[PDB]
Amino acid sequence: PVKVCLIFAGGTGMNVATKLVDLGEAVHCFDTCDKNVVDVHRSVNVTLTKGTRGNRKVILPLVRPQIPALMDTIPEADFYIVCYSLGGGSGSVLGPLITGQLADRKASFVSFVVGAMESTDNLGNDIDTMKTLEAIAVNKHLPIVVNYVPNTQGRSYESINDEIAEKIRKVVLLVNQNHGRLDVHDVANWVRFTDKHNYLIPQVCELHIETTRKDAENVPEAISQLSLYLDPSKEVAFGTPIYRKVGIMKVDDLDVTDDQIHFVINSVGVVEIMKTITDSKLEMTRQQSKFTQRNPIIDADDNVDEDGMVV
Numbered sequence: 001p002v003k004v005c006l007i008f009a010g011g012t013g014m015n016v017a018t019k020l021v022d023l024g025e026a027v028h029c030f031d032t033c034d035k036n037v038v039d040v041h042r043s044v045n046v047t048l049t050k051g052t053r054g055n056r057k058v059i060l061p062l063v064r065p066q067i068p069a070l071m072d073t074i075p076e077a078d079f080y081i082v083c084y085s086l087g088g089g090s091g092s093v094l095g096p097l098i099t100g101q102l103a104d105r106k107a108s109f110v111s112f113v114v115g116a117m118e119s120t121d122n123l124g125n126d127i128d129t130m131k132t133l134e135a136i137a138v139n140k141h142l143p144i145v146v147n148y149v150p151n152t153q154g155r156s157y158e159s160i161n162d163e164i165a166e167k168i169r170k171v172v173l174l175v176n177q178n179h180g181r182l183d184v185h186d187v188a189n190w191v192r193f194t195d196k197h198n199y200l201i202p203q204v205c206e207l208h209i210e211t212t213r214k215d216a217e218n219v220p221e222a223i224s225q226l227s228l229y230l231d232p233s234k235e236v237a238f239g240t241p242i243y244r245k246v247g248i249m250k251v252d253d254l255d256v257t258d259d260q261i262h263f264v265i266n267s268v269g270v271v272e273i274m275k276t277i278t279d280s281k282l283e284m285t286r287q288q289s290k291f292t293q294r295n296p297i298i299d300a301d302d303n304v305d306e307d308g309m310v311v
């Protein structure tokens, strides 16, 4: 198995991938067409589904039978990262289907998902995709751990994509197997926390990636925590998580970007994430339902022919 396999789906996933092409063979991209394929993608894996050239209900029956074929192109790995938009039609279908397959592999993985906010279609998709991940968490009895990134009004997709790529790199660093005290089994039991803590409920959880003790301590109701430290003198057993582990980073590790990084998993924040999306959609739909249009400028006295000609 490789150390980590990175999986990207849909346009948003393709776009984020462009920022990670230096990871090469470890990167696997999937989409239903080539609208988002650019030259830099030659450096990574790209697979497009057949017969599929925004509506998830339409895309699902077309792509479902192809999933096994997609999975054969994804090597066995010690950890996976999955990335896509919750709000489109392709990423939000391919992403969760592949995620289900990773759960069947008994894999350790996290996802980076985008809350798209343009339209009631985006918002409806966001809701259905979050519900999808919840259903998968239940059906596979496994936490589905996601770093949720909302497209906040006024912020460029470029900016958001940059932030996501930088977080993905921290996870790639986390799982690089080069840290003192930190095992592949330690990582597995961090993210698959229900395996050994059977009294906990598998569900959609959030991943919070923080670079200070203060920020990490402020994650509410933390369930499972992993901390990396460059200066082992700064290690402090803070917070109240159920599961906690620490790794010591190496100063000659060129990928070490920060002095300490905390990866905190909780789930209480998902309620507010859903509420924000549904309230936004309600407000947009209120406006749509309030919109009115004039009466017709034709009526029963008008002689209309088969082609719509009034002469």
Ligand SMILES: Nc1nc2c(ncn2[C@@H]2O[C@H](COP(=O)(O)OP(=O)(O)O)[C@@H](O)[C@H]2O)c(=O)[nH]1
Binding pocket: 009, 010, 011, 012, 013, 015, 016, 054, 084, 085, 087, 088, 089, 090, 091, 092, 114, 116, 117, 118, 122, 151, 157, 158, 160, 161
């Ligand atoms: N953060 C981010 N959001 C995007 C990007 N492209 C599109 N979006 C938003 O995500 C929604 C889904 O787009 P996309 O991922 O291309 O759809 P898909 O190809 O059907 O999976 C769009 O309606 C936008 O609101 C991107 O590059 N970054």
Ligand SMILES: [Mg+2]
Binding pocket: 010, 011, 035, 088, 090
């Ligand atoms: Mg697309």
